Design a protein around this ligand. Sequence first.
Ligand SMILES: O=P(O)(O)C(O)(Cc1cccnc1)P(=O)(O)O
Ligand SMILES: O=P(O)(O)C(O)(Cc1cccnc1)P(=O)(O)O
Ligand SMILES: [Mg+2]
Ligand SMILES: [Mg+2]
Ligand SMILES: [Mg+2]
Ligand SMILES: [Mg+2]
Ligand SMILES: [Mg+2]
Ligand SMILES: [Mg+2]
Lengths: 337, 337
Amino acid sequence: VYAQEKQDFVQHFSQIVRVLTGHPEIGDAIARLKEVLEYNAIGGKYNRGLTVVVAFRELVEPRKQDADSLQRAWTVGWCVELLQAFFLVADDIMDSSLTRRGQICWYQKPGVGLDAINDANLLEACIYRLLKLYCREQPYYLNLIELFLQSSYQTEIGQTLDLLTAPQGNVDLVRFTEKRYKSIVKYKAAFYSFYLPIAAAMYMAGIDGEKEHANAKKILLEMGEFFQIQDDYLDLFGDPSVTGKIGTDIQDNKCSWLVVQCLQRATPEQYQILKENYGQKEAEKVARVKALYEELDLPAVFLQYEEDSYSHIMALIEQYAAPLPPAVFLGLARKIY
Amino acid sequence: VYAQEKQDFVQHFSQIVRVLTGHPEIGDAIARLKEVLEYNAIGGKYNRGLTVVVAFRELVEPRKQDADSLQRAWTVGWCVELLQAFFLVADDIMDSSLTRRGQICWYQKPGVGLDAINDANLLEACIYRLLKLYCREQPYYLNLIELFLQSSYQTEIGQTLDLLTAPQGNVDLVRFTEKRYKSIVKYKAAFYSFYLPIAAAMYMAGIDGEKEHANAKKILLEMGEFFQIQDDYLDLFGDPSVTGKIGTDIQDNKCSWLVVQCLQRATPEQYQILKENYGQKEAEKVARVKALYEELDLPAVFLQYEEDSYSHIMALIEQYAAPLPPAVFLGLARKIY
Ligand SMILES: O=P(O)(O)C(O)(Cc1cccnc1)P(=O)(O)O
Ligand SMILES: O=P(O)(O)C(O)(Cc1cccnc1)P(=O)(O)O
Ligand SMILES: [Mg+2]
Ligand SMILES: [Mg+2]
Ligand SMILES: [Mg+2]
Ligand SMILES: [Mg+2]
Ligand SMILES: [Mg+2]
Ligand SMILES: [Mg+2]
């Protein structure tokens, strides 16, 4: 479903850049915007943006899937990729990360630095520019603006919770609880990751019912929770040649799923080893935390969690998919699991 | 007009915080949002936010100025103050500034640092939260969302131009031209400063005509240009106990109105003195640039410019105010001149 549709979606990016790139006085700023778009919105798997297009084609009647409607689906897809690019550029600064999508983080590039804050804001502004340029005369225009703005607010509340729970050089393991973890992931990852692209396709298809959006959200928020838990696992146990990024969760004192699982399994001595080595820059201290995680068999605990989560989401698809075609959620589940 | 209306406007901030402050799981994030709002949206002159309220009362018929309409005017006023707070928090980071509104910059506060990037994003999100909570059922709802989003995009293009023209440790005086300066100020300051609050009051009053908005923009963009030129002057020649902020334009290699005026008046020897001392941290080098500016009588050049600008804007009010009451623009001109 995502496979052949990927080519046409990635090919549509050049049009998005052309349409986004009022006198020649702002020429140097438009060139900088092009540079920011090319560096930060290209190189990923495009799964969020592709989900708009795939879901659009499964929800809209083929007679209504005209050339202009497809153009709008691809643009709304790229709007979701731009929301993602805005949050990642800012998150890389705030998490002091080194690489993203197999290249150095935009802010780490010589000559960029903290100018990346405004670049991230420009990426966010491009979304509403594209929605006006392509969807202004559509009946779902306000639904889409409100959806992107709401997704941005919920993600930012999540980021606030993430940063509050991880104060630099302030190790407080008591703060790292299961309830706190579930709250962080729900807001920072679950709304914008899967609910935003499906909801966008739903509004474009004329599906604006409250109960239909609530039912889709019940499946999608659980898939978003799994996705962030997997993200936390891959921060330490993933192959950076596959993830395209270097992990910083232990160094940054994050309330990771791994530290939460460690804490509910650690002995008082193991707890002390974690206490002495967590939230610190020293490679040797980070290695001690990873050693403790491997000793507590957190990779096998995660493998069991992935299996239990998959079955749970599948049970939710059976309960809540109707009247939407279950393929909408199944295609997405196959992509993230 | 602004004087007695200031009290009711500032008193309405506690309501805005209460309405903005969905389970208790995000409680710590809401407390952080309250902290960010109190530190970054309070302490200024509130002229932009007050302009919405003052213009609303002068454009709307008194019979239609009911208790609920006034509540919406105050909220839209505070939305403009929040847009300003979002841009200033990020601009202080990017300009490496020390103080703002008589206190240390939010990002310079111990324990905040680069977390301020997400805080600035939350301030921007609060705008659209308030517009939905108070103006969702109003006929001008979409006009206001589009206005705030457009103002944000234009401001960001301006910031891009500002940062591009000021690369750190890269002194290139040839880039500092009058045409480049006019382009920067137009985008980064003129749209969001005066056009945004008057346009908001205009849409709330049912004034949505293209020609009426274009005529108001012709007056207001010129007032915005003056305001940024005055801002650049006060960066070096203003009293920080009145401005509430320490100047960084010379240290940051900015395309200031002062450097542009210096360049069109400097001898080849004076040009070399500027070349050797501009865009550098050293207090002695900054003092040499200020000495050169004082030698070229840039404070008197600015005083003449303020006089010529005032008369020009007044001539524009005579040409373009109609059918709006000229008091709308006169009250604003008395406040900034
Ligand atoms: O890519 P990362 O950086 O691993 C992340 O998932 C990026 C991200 C950014 C913004 C919102 N949610 C997740 P994080 O939470 O910082 O681990
Ligand atoms: O307050 P400042 O910092 O003097 C400024 O006017 C703040 C500002 C921020 C964003 C957009 N326009 C002006 P700047 O341009 O950096 O001189
Ligand atoms: Mg990160
Ligand atoms: Mg992060
Ligand atoms: Mg991560
Ligand atoms: Mg500044
Ligand atoms: Mg600045
Ligand atoms: Mg300034």
